[PDB]
Structure formats: C-alpha cells, structure tokens
Amino acid sequence: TLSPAVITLLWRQDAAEFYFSRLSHLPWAMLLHSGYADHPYSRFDIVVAEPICTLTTFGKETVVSESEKRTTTTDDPLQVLQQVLDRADIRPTHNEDLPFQGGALGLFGYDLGRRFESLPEIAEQDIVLPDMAVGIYDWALIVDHQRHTVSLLSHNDVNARRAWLESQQFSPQEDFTLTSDWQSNMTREQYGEKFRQVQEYLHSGDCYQVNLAQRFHATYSGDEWQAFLQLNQANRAPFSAFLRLEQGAILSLSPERFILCDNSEIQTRPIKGTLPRANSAKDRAENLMIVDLMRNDIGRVAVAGSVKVPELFVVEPFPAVHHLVSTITAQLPEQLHASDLLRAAFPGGSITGAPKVRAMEIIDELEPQRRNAWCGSIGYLSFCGNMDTSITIRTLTAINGQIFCSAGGGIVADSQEEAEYQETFDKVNRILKQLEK
C-alpha cells in the first residue's frame, strides 16, 4: 500500500501542544506526549482527531461506528479492532521515522480485562467510561524530537487536512478549578484492613504479590486541557496522553511503557519499587516477580526462545519519586499481530501482582470501586503493524463534574502496612497538590 502523503510543517519544540490546543475540546481528539522528557524513549509526540471509525466497548458489547454504518457485536474487542484495521485495506511499509501511520489510537481500560478472564463483580462500577474507546485515524501529526521535524501524514487528502488543521481554533478558556478537597475512598483503617487481607491471602498461598490501590476524588469545574498542560510540564513523563472522549477526559502523566511492538520487535518495561525524591532488597525483589510475570505473559505469543531480560533494576528519577524498572524483550511471530499480543498480556502484570487472575480477584474483592481507566493502557495500533502502549499509572479521570486519581502499591510478605500506605501517597502527592493550585 501506497504510503501516505506527507507534508512537513514548520518545526517548533512545542508543536504538539501548539497544534493540539485547537483540538483539545473535540471528542476523539487524542494526544500522546513524551513529556518533553530526558529519556531514551521520549522521541515522539503524536496527535489525531476526526477518526473515520470509532469503537466503544462497554462490558460485553462493542459499538463500531462509521459514516453511514453503525454495528454492535459481542465478539472479542481486540479481534474486532483488528478486523476493522484489516478491512480499511491500508497497509504502509514500516518507517522508523513515522512509528504511527494512521490506525487505531486510544484507551484500553483496566475493566476490559473482564473480557479476557472470568472475574468477580464485587467492586462498584461507579464510573460510566468505556472499557475500550478507540478511534480509527487515516491521518496523523507526528512530532520527532530526534530529527526535529513535524510531519502531517494522510492516507486521504493531505492538503485537505492541513487546511482543516489550519482553520481549527484555540477555544475560549474556562478556568480549571478543584471545588472540594481530595478525598480518599479508604480510611487508614480501611486501607489497614485490606493490606492485612492481602497478606493473609499471601500467607495462605493464593498469591505472591497483589497491587492494592486507593482512590482519590474531588469535584472540579473548568476545562481540563490547561490543567493537563501544567501537569505535563511538571511530570515530564515519557508516556503521557490527553484523551478527549465522548464521556469525559483522560489526563495521563504516565512514565510507564506497557508493550512496545516495533517492526515485530517486542519491548515491555514494567515499573516496580520506588522511594520518594537501588539495592533495595525488598523492592529489587518485588520487581523480579513482575519481570517473571511479563516473561510469561509475552512468552505466550512470542517466538520460541526469543524472550530476554536485557535489563534489571535501573533507577529512573522522576519528580515525585525514584522508580525501579526492568526490561523484557522478545520477537513477535510474523504470523501474528501486535493486537494478539496485547490481548495475551492485558492488563499489565506490573499493576495486578502474580499470579494475575487470583491477583485480580483479590483486587476486585478489596478495592471499593472498579478501576475503569486507571492502570489500563493507552496507545496505538498502526496500520503498518507497530504498536506502543503505556500503563495508565499517574493518570486522572475527569468526568461529570468529578476528577479521580488512584494510587497503588505492590504488596508482598515483606511489606509493612504503614510504609506501604505511605507509598501510595508518595506516587501521587505532587499531582493532587498541584491541582489544588
């Protein structure tokens, strides 16, 4: 397939924020931003909007929507997504300077997991935001920080789209304000109780690590884009994203890559262990259990002896905390898609806690609400076959007047109740605080 047409645009370090600001209020407008980060994997920023097809999954049903046709289906949501992908009959050859050339882009929420495993339904469902919300885009705006170039690509009419881009305006305000203090869904004693429940479950053998999180919430008013813009500057997280959905918006400040699939080369970098702003025997041990997880997760689809562990226990300094990351690599077989892979490993072992299903069972049992978008993934499935995805840690959900932000902490035998309590706070204190002003 006839590669897309490309127009290079004027260069500017902030082009991503610059062009996106006139799209930010549009439903299905999405920005993947590398957080202006100093990082090996912070080369690109990508913008899309105006999809030619969208997919929305709520539970058991997926709605596939185009121009002139709307269908519903109970089939597997990633199978369905891949079928939509193949019928667009668009398949450009792979290009290291354009990792997305149109294709699927969006949100894969934590509860989407429910379509891949049978799970209990204890946690309350109190957020109405889809389990899968992704657009099919025949164009993209790509900002390359390595090469310094801004490329506008279209499989359609790339003059038409520059034209359309041009004309979009950056929209009269409305100031973001938090209208309540942050409030947790747990007291210290309720956290306390479920931390011990976790440990009795670890002591009685079901699991060996379980990620337990608390959720903070508040009322707010105003537009979320400016707030994103000040959170992004302060977090400089390499896998950040701003998603304007039909239901509300997602402000991700994630520094964590889930799965990269680049020209069939697989990379996943789970984050596990932190201290506030790396010999830490308990953490560089909590991480290894997650590394083994991933090993197993990607190796269910990977090329036979392709899984390697090129990197263990590296610390990366971030605004809020010091974190520990490991890296696992592998090769996708030429007969499968990045989407089969996503499906085999979703949701991320680093935010569930091995073994994954039993770990997800406890989470549903102890967390008072479903996680919805938090700890699910955001990313793209390009028409060229590449894939990149994050773990939506450090991520808020802004919907119907309310904004949410969760915080988790991995629990193992060696974990201590008050210190783990504090870690959940450590991870998001700069984010709750900045929003308060």
Ligand X SMILES: N[C@@H](Cc1c[nH]c2ccccc12)C(=O)O
Residues annotated catalytic, as ranges: 256, 272
> Is residue 379 involved in binding ligand X (CB under 6 A)?
yes
> Is residue 44 involved in binding ligand X (CB under 6 A)?
yes
Q: Binding site annotation covers 43? A: yes
Q: Contact at 8 Å (CB) between 1 and 90?
A: yes
> Is residue 248 involved in binding ligand X (CB under 6 A)?
no
Contacts (Cβ under 8 Å, ≥6 apart) of 419:
none
Nearer to ligand X, 85 or 178 (CB): 85
* Least spacing, CB of residue 256 vs ligand X, in Å: 9
Chain-centroid distance, C-alpha 353? 18
Rounded CA-CA distance 219/231 in Å is 18
| Burial label, 404 (beta-carbon count in 10 A; 0-12, 13-18, 19+) | buried
> Is residue 185 involved in binding ligand X (CB under 6 A)?
no
Among 24, 274, 390, 415, indicate the residue that binds ligand X (CB under 6 A). 390
Among 19, 20, 24, 33, indicate the residue that binds ligand X (CB under 6 A). 33
> Is residue 137 involved in binding ligand X (CB under 6 A)?
no
Instruction: Provide φ and ψ at 30, rounded to 5°.
Output: -135, 140
Rounded CA-CA distance 325/256 in Å is 9
> Is residue 268 involved in binding ligand X (CB under 6 A)?
no
Q: Binding site annotation covers 238? A: yes
> Is residue 378 involved in binding ligand X (CB under 6 A)?
yes
Candidate ranges 83-91, 221-229, 388-396, 404-412; the one touching ligand X (CB under 6 A): 388-396
Q: Binding site annotation covers 284? A: no
> Is residue 238 involved in binding ligand X (CB under 6 A)?
yes
Phi-psi category of 193—alpha, beta or left, where left has phi over 0 and alpha has psi -120 to 50? Answer: alpha
Of the candidates 236, 241, 271, the one whose C-alpha atom is nearest the C-alpha of residue 256 is 271
> Is residue 240 involved in binding ligand X (CB under 6 A)?
yes
Q: Binding site annotation covers 65? A: no
Q: How many residues bind ligand X (CB under 6 A)?
A: 17
Among 182, 216, 239, 346, indicate the residue that binds ligand X (CB under 6 A). 239
> Is residue 382 involved in binding ligand X (CB under 6 A)?
no
Could you tell me which residues are beta bridge partners of residue 45? Answer: 143
Q: Binding site annotation covers 346? A: no
Nearer to ligand X, 185 or 395 (CB): 395
Q: Binding site annotation covers 42? A: yes
Give the burial string for 273-285 (b: 16+ CB within 10 Å, else e): bbeeeeebeebbe
| Burial label, 118 (beta-carbon count in 10 A; 0-12, 13-18, 19+) | exposed
In this structure, the number of other CB atoms found within 10 A of the CB of residue 401 comes to 11
Nearer to ligand X, 130 or 286 (CB): 130
Known binding-site residue numbers for L-tryptophan: 34, 41-44, 238-240
Contacts with ligand X by CB under 6 A lie at 32-34, 41-44, 99, 238-241, 378-379, 388-390
